[PDB]
Design an enzyme around this catalytic site. Sequence first.
Site, PDB file in Angstrom:
ATOM      1  N   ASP A   1      20.848 -22.188 -22.788  1.00  0.00           N
ATOM      2  CA  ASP A   1      20.785 -20.796 -22.363  1.00  0.00           C
ATOM      3  C   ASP A   1      21.883 -20.067 -23.120  1.00  0.00           C
ATOM      4  O   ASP A   1      23.060 -20.419 -22.996  1.00  0.00           O
ATOM      5  CB  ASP A   1      20.978 -20.665 -20.849  1.00  0.00           C
ATOM      6  CG  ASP A   1      20.804 -19.233 -20.336  1.00  0.00           C
ATOM      7  OD1 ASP A   1      20.626 -18.290 -21.135  1.00  0.00           O
ATOM      8  OD2 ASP A   1      20.853 -19.046 -19.104  1.00  0.00           O
TER       9      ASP A   1
ATOM     10  N   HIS B   1      -3.354  -7.952  -6.954  1.00  0.00           N
ATOM     11  CA  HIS B   1      -3.133  -7.992  -8.392  1.00  0.00           C
ATOM     12  C   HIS B   1      -4.468  -7.966  -9.127  1.00  0.00           C
ATOM     13  O   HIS B   1      -5.455  -8.551  -8.674  1.00  0.00           O
ATOM     14  CB  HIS B   1      -2.339  -9.237  -8.778  1.00  0.00           C
TER      15      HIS B   1
END
EC number: 3.1.-.-
Length: 1342
Positions: A10, A826
């Site tokens: 990361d 959705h």
Amino acid sequence: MDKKYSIGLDIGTNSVGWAVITDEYKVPSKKFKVLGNTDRHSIKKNLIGALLFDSGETAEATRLKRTARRRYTRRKNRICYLQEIFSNEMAKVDDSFFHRLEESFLVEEDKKHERHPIFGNIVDEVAYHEKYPTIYHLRKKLVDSTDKADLRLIYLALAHMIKFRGHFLIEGDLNPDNSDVDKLFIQLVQTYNQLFEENPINASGVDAKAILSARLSKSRRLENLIAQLPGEKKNGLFGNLIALSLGLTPNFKSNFDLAEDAKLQLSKDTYDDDLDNLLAQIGDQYADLFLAAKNLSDAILLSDILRVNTEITKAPLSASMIKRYDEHHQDLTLLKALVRQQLPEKYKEIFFDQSKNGYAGYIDGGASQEEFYKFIKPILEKMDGTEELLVKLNREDLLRKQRTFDNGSIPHQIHLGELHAILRRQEDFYPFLKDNREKIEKILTFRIPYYVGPLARGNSRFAWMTRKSEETITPWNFEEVVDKGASAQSFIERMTNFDKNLPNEKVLPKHSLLYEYFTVYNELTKVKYVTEGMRKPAFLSGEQKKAIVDLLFKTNRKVTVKQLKEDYFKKIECFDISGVEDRFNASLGTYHDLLKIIKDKDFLDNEENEDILEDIVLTLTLFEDREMIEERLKTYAHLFDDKVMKQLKRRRYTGWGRLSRKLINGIRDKQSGKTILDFLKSDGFANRNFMQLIHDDSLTFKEDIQKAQVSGQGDSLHEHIANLAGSPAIKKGILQTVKVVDELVKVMGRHKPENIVIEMARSRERMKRIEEGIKELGSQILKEHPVENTQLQNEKLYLYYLQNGRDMYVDQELDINRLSDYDVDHIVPQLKDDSIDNKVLTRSDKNRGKSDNVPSEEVVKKMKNYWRQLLNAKLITQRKFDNLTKAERGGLSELDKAGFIKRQLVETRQITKHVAQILDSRMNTKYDENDKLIREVKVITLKSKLVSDFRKDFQFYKVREINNYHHAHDAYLNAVVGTALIKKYPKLESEFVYGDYKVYDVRKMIAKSEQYFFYSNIMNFFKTEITLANGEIRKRPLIETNGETGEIVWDKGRDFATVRKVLSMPQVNIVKKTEVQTGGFSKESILPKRNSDKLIARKKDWDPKKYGGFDSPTVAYSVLVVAKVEKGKSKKLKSVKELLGITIMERSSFEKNPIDFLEAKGYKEVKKDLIIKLPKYSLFELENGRKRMLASAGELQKGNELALPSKYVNFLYLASHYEKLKGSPEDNEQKQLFVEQHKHYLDEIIEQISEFSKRVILADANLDKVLSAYNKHRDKPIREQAENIIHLFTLTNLGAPAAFKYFDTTIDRKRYTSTKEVLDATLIHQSITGLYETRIDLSQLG
RNA sequence: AGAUGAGACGCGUUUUAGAGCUAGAAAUAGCAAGUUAAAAUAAGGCUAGUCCGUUAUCAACUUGAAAAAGUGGCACCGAGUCGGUGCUU
DNA sequence: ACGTTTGTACTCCAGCG
DNA sequence: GCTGGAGTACAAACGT
């Protein structure tokens, strides 16, 4: 010798997370040997951790201070030049005058001459100061009077006029064309009328001198100027420009109907960036008009100062300052009288108290004009007979100083005219002034041009200039020495930036004709036409688009789209808008500008004159000196006229584009024989825009761009990072990522991994949109329903307003208060289209029954007309309308599914592709027999939505405020997600793994039928029980496998437990990067003289006890010193171990030689080999496990880290977002029941924080205050309690101690300012990962 | 979208110069005045230019003038900042 | 033992248009 | 704006 591991990463701006997994998604732990002199020899450590560092800084501050240093050096050189022209006769008038003027800073005890610099005695100095109270009295006397004056006074006026000489924004002498308020007002009106030409303002009988320059309050001047114009209003656009020119701060938000606030003020330093932002949101055609407003303001403020009758005095600035001095004196004695008669009690407050903002603070204190005015306004309103002072007070013309903040509007030719007048007036009385008039005038008027740069001899990173001779460059022999053409050429070759796509090619100017045609055709190719009988809107044909451009854009600049067809289809095609706005934004502004310059269309229309106009545009863009512009236009003279040459001299384009000419007209596809500009010119059946041409695998533009980016950056790692695009904060993180990758390769026995997974860290607008839509449809959302759209920021409120309170599929309305009766569906279920475009509000209907398509045919027939009305009222977006009409468009097709999978899969940021290129280049270094790269590491890049959904579905929840473990946890989760995606779908490696190979087609890989990836999701293979659209369920197999190979990858029970175990793991490797501090020496404020000893001398021989100086020096690093020191009065040598900090000045003077520096510091018999250098953030381990990080010589920081069990952080997340679940009503109700069933975790976590703080923090006053506050607010709701419980975590956080707030009470920070406990601790020397350590027991040292 | 680079203004700050007056031995009080200028504006450095000095880079130890290179066993059971067992060194 | 010299708690501050 | 410097009031710790 084979390990088969993988590395996850990361990358952030302040953090780099890293982790190492095996094939079973399990991080291994190894024991490391530590060095030093302690007794520990093996530390078991986990191969997961994070690295924290300070953010990288840009170089703009260094640039500004470098520039200021250069101007100070050049100003001192100008003064010195005037000194060496005056010295020989200044010696006659007063031999040591210049010594007195030079050494005037010092004290009478340190002066070798008399105290008074000018005349050198008492009586003549007081007589001079009574005769000329300011310098402007003397300047007016020297210009006006024709009597023989003293040479010292001439020098003093001349040097004051040379040192402070005003700006250079006006080219040439002052003339009424470029100085007068009326002429610049007419120019501003002409620019406004040119820019619109529809309902213009015509100002012919106006007298702008009478209105704007009048001695009136500026709001009333604005009101009188607007009162002459019938059409325009006060808050109209041109009215706000007049207000801006007058010096006011107007809002431009309602002028261009921008929802965001648009207050622009000239006097603010932020105006440059605010104008750039404003022009970005309103278009760049408003640039010259606002620049003309700035010019009008310069003329207005110049006439505000220069307000004396110039016919009676040839020096108007000195006479104006005389008038301001006299009015200041008159209002001073008048105000003294009125506060003597009316308010005698407040006299000592206004006229004596320097701490207050009265007149004493205005003159002697640090009070500005605004604070003095704000102080004296309510006192003045309270008395009577002070109407005049209030009239001056709303005009900012009361008790005014001479050296004010607004003298920056004075051009240099005012001082030049005063200088010329002085030199004529005292000419025949000194012969040397007649000999050196032009030299002094040249000293004042000389300015180093932009392209010449710093005058260096070779020792400069920033210089590029070349010389003809080798001598000193005085301002007089500047042209005889400086090679101007080669300096200009080097300036062009070195300062213009390179293209992102082609690092070895040169970008275009912003207003350059290739880029103008490129952007016009880039917006024009995606434009359809709608004419007569035709069902499908086809894009504009290339011949038709070219003809339309050449007949409309080249004729009327900014063209209306309604006027487009009116003049293209209705008129030109004789057939009375699609894919366009109300008007076409892109226009050939430079074309019409040069047309007005030259009055010859045929010169511009000729393709052979393209390079001529190109060189004209570039020369007007990068150059600004008039002589160089004329010199490089001199080659372009014989094809042109002299008048046009003058107009071309005046015009100044500014700005640079982002595209290169090899990237527009240079690159040619060998198979097709057409350029990017030829494709935009005519592409037949495609008319694809610029990205689509450069994103085409069937064309060579991929292979050309990928090959031409190669070797655009150096072979070195530092060189490759250096000239790469992006912020330096991301470059620091990329370099640290490369370093941690190589050491992580080192730590596993020199084994290359399999994968190196990389992840780069990544209301009022709605109310304006809702109000526009409600007004477009005539809705009752603001008429019958209350208008509270500014407070409507919830998703239900967003949808309710956007759907006009009527459900999308239900053919009726829905109650606004009864949101439970409504629901949200959705559109494209599991793409994770969580945006409000797909999240329609459905009150009753459940999509009417479907698998993946959002509507049915009946649902399309229901929400066809209403959705069309919503899209006409801008409520329904084009993507949302396409989603709601997909069923009549064919349901869900395989190409749409391919778009969905590539949307979750392809990253778009170029910096991620770049950092993948460095890591893939540094790990794959072997070649095959045919020189093909041996891929031993598959570099995998993802996007943050994947791992975000992986957190939010399986309850691996993250809150950021407990500890810095989340960086390493995100790295681990990224590693397992990327490796799972490459194990389950290996054939998808062409989509995100670095390298172009085995491209394949997602068009057929979806397979569109039951029995690779059929559903509309690319992460659904993790979910053990997938849901459906219209209230149904669909089970999933437990163990996942690859389609072709037999390999179990996602056994559900055993991997979730492993990820839980790894996430709940107490010890990861958090390392704060030790840095040596660099920057400024100290605080830049200069303080008055003190008796204390921590004042830094401003020079060598300026002692701060009588001169003042700086304080708070920044410590570079610290040194542990063991030595003896003087004790008692009997010369006793008491040994002392001590920690001492080294300032940057002392860092240079101490790295030069340490030992004698320490002896001169006060130490005796030091041990040279026991000098331990301690930079910032040096880790020290103490008793019981307490860790402290060194922040300075006398301040530590918190070093430990709080490891909370996963139940506590999961509860902390779930209680924090009680009202923001955003899921199914059943799942939300279950979560609410869970959090309301377990609430004792608050007491357990308070006990946890109490034990941790009693262990390693030792801040018992703050801890008792926290506990008392917590007991005080027991009877409180859980949702309000959770947010302040997680606010509480900064007490035990890692790093600097900060001040926080729990509920009402604000807790002050406990700071650790004592390092005496550190010298009996164990110093820790950590590697870049912290796996490799070196522990030194400092009790045994010395 | 984002780096870098060049030329200039205007303030601000700090010391000094702009003789403060009357009454009491003082402490002090009452009164008058005030707007400007010089110098410095990162200490300073040498290659002595009308240059350069706040960006970037940096754990420790061993070589190397620097550049740069080199230095740390492995499995299994567990977990409060890492612990324990076994094999081989 | 007397009295003079170091640790805690708090506040304010930081070149800018 | 963050976070280290500096000043100040006050008591504890201690050197003479």
